Each structure stands twice: as C-alpha cells, then as structure tokens.
C-alpha cells in the first residue's frame, strides 16, 4: 500500500484523463512489460495486488519495475450526509493513467512466464491492457 | 482560595485530607474566629493553628496553585509559636 | 591562494550606479571623466546619439606640463574643455564622476569648469 | 504602546500636525520640524 510520505495539499481536484500519456510509453528498464489501452485511476491496493500476484507466480523472478506511483489523493465524504459543508476527507491514494502508458515491467524471466504474470495482474486491474516488449 | 488548598500549596500540611480533618476538628482559627476547610483566605490574613498543644500564629502574603517546593514558603510568614 | 578584483571594474559598477540617474543630451550633455594613474581624460557627450562633442586630456599636446596626474593638471584640462564647449556654445551640462569621488582632481577639474563658465 | 499625538508649533501655538509613536521607545514629549502655514516657515513643533 504505497504512500507519498509528504504532500503540499491533502485535497486536490480530481482532474481529467484526456489524451495519451506523456512518457513511460515503452519498456526500457525491463524486457517484457504491460501497457494500458484506456484511462483510469488506479489505487495502491490494486497495484500491490498485482505486484504480489506476479511475484507469487514468479517466486524468484528477476525484477519488476512498477512505473507509477499513486501521488494523487482522493476524498470521500462520510456516509449518509447531505451535500456541502466543505470538501470530504481524504480516503486513499491514486495514480492517474493515460493510455499508451506502461505500468509494470519484467526482466530476468522468459516471455511466457512474463505474459502469464502480467495476465494475472491485468485481471486484478480494471482496465484493458496489452503485452509489450522492448525494441 | 480555600484553607485546605492553601495549607497544601504552602506545604504547612502535607495532605489536603489532613487539612480537611484538622479543620473539621476545629483545632485552628483565622483572625480569632473558628474556621473550616472551605473558609476563604487572602493576603494580609492572620492565622492561628494547633498541632496538639503546639500553637502557631502566621501571616498570609500571597496565594497560587503551581507552588514549587521552595517558593511555597514565600506565600506566607511565621509570626509566633506557643504551647 | 588569494584573489583580487579590478578596481576599474568596481569603478564601472559605481559609474553605472550613477548613470542610472542621468544621461547627456543636446543642451544638457554629460561630462565624463577618466582617471588613469598617469593621466586624466575628459569628454562631453550627447548620450542620446552616442557622440562626443569635445574632449581634453593631459595627453593633449597643448599645455604640456610635468605632473599629468595632479590637481593642477586637472584644473588646466578643465579650463581647456570649458573653452572648447564655449566655442561650441553650449554653456550648460551635467557632470559624471565616473565611480570616483567629487573630492580630489575630479573636484578641481569640475571647479575649473564652473569658474570657466560651464553651468552644471 | 503605540499612541496618537499632535505636534503643535511654538511660535504659532497651533497644532497643525498629527502622528503616532511608541510610549516605550519614545516616552518623552517629542519634537520635530514642520511647516507652519501661518508662520509660513519650517519651525519646531512639539508634542502635547
């Protein structure tokens, strides 16, 4: 459950996930990676689920290199409450994702193993994905 | 302030319980009048006290609650002893 | 180790600090000064056009003397430039102590020009 | 404390000016010079 240690503002606007990514569109730390085909917010619980999933499938395998970090916080008012009276309290932390963006990489491991692990992770994630490799 | 609190903060009596007890016995007095633990006190007060036969007369200069140990005795002055 | 700054560069900073407040025009030009260890030079300028009008120096072959570097020389060159700006009848100027003091040779020169007719 | 003040002339007797000051840093009856528009001059003014 990743966390930014320190932040300026505990409360931010949400934003808009228009367009494609700026960077991180291609694997370069590792060999076999995964990228997105949509745009969405992703949570520390999602990423750690995917991470531990692939690492359990691999059991010693090489290196991973996540390519993101949930910097963004997201609020949520308490339950059964009218509107207004200030912005809701923070709940967790979020990473924002554009399409064309690489999320997880892999090295030290064969292609079939990598593809299967990333499949497993994709099923923990909400969005549509693609298997990718380095050029 | 109250007499029992005052006695404790001035460290004349080591326990507020004892101050209450002796004031309920009425062994003491203020300005020649018999008094009680709830009796009010102030600067310029003249206090008469007993410890068995040991009779003591003292004068009030100040009052406070935080009362660190040596500063407690600045709160008042001994005048006299009798028996 | 040690390191040492060029007092000329310092003088340039002080000169610029001055220059921020003024500039020489027609009918109110700028009178600028230079103070070599062995010479003293003076010029009169329309800073608008970036043009000198008159000039003077110990180096001038007229009135060659021994000091070229004391207050006497400063006075002589001051009166010289004054009559230059008289025959180009401007008679009204502004002074530019170029990061120097209005204390010594500079002061003497300026006083010379004041006496010769130039009005600051 | 920071407190208001009037600053009266001495030839004219007129008040003519106001300001403020610390009583701590400037306790004494302060004085300055200002223009008296009746005496038509710079002139020492005094606090009241």
């Amino acid at each position: 459950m990743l966390l930014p240690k320190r932040v300026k503002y505990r409360r931010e606007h949400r934003g808009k996930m228009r367009g494609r990514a700026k960077g991180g569109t291609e694997v370069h730390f590792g060999e076999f990676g995964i990228q997105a085909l949509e745009a969405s917010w992703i949570t520390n619980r999602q990423i750690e689920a995917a991470r531990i999933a692939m690492t359990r499938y691999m059991k010693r395998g090489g290196k991973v290199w996540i390519k993101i970090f949930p910097s963004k916080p997201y609020t949520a008012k308490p339950l059964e409450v009218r509107m207004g009276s200030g912005k809701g309290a923070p709940e967790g932390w979020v990473a924002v994702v554009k399409p064309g963006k690489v999320l997880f990489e892999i090295s030290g491991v064969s292609e079939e193993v990598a593809r299967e692990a990333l499949r497993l992770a994709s099923h923990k994630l909400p969005i549509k994905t693609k298997f990718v490799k380095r050029e | 302030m109250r007499l029992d609190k005052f006695l404790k903060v001035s460290r004349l009596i080591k326990r507020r319980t004892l101050a209450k007890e002796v004031a309920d016995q009425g062994r003491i007095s203020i300005n020649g009048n018999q008094a009680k633990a709830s009796s009010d006190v102030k600067p310029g007060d003249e206090l008469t006290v007993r410890f068995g036969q040991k009779l003591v007369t003292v004068q009030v200069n100040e009052l406070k609650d935080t009362t660190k140990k040596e500063e407690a005795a600045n709160m008042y002055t001994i005048l006299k002893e009798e028996k | 180790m040690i390191t040492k700054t060029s007092k000329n560069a310092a003088r340039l900073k002080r000169h610029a600090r001055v220059r921020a407040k003024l500039s020489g025009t027609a009918e109110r030009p700028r009178l600028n000064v230079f103070r070599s260890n062995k010479h003293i030079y003076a010029q009169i300028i329309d800073d608008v056009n970036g043009v000198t009008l008159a000039s003077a120096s110990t180096l001038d072959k007229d009135l060659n003397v021994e000091s070229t570097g004391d207050t006497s020389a400063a006075t002589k060159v001051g009166e010289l430039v004054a009559k230059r700006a008289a025959e180009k009848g401007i008679s009204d100027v502004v002074f530019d102590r170029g990061g120097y003091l209005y204390h010594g040779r500079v002061k003497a020169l300026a006083d010379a020009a004041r006496e010769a007719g130039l009005k600051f | 404390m920071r407190v208001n003040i009037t600053l009266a002339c001495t030839e004219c007797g007129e008040r003519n000016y106001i300001s403020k000051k610390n009583k701590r840093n400037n306790p004494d009856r302060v004085e300055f010079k200002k223009y008296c528009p009746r005496d038509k001059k710079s002139t020492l003014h005094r606090e009241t």
Partner: protein
C-alpha cells in the same frame, strides 16, 4: 440525519483590476495610467513614470509602445508626434 461543518476556507480578497489599461499604438493623454501591477512585471521607459503602487503612467501625450529590456524583461514607452 447527521451533522457536520467547519470548512474554514471560505474567503478571498476583492479583485483588483490589474493589467494593461491602454494598448500599443493607442493615443494617450498626460497622466493616463497604462498598466496596474504589483512590483514590476513591466518597467517604464521614455516619458513614462512609476508610482508608489508600482503603476505606470504617461507623463505626456503620445502613443504607446511596448518593448523588451533586452532579454526576459519588458518595457513601455510613450512617443509623441
């Protein structure tokens, strides 16, 4: 039903209508202001003056022109006919 509150972030200052007030190539009278600001986003130039509020005004009549102090620094000026 529940009960909540205490936003304590509910104010802001009055908007002060900064920016330029006259345009390049525009004729201007004496004393007209040109660019309200705070500090110097822009400096004065010829026949232009700065005030205690860092505001820029024309000392004369003329036409306005904005330029640059060499690099990364701007300027205004009034040039008459």
């Amino acid at each position: 039903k529940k009960g909540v509150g205490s936003t304590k972030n509910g104010r802001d200052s009055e908007a002060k209508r900064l920016g330029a007030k006259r345009a390049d190539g525009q004729f201007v009278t004496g004393g007209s202001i040109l660019y309200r600001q705070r500090g110097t986003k822009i400096y004065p130039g010829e026949n232009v003056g700065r005030g205690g509020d860092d505001t820029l005004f024309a000392k004369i009549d003329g036409t306005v022109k904005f330029e640059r102090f060499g690099r990364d620094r701007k300027k205004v000026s009034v040039y008459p006919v």
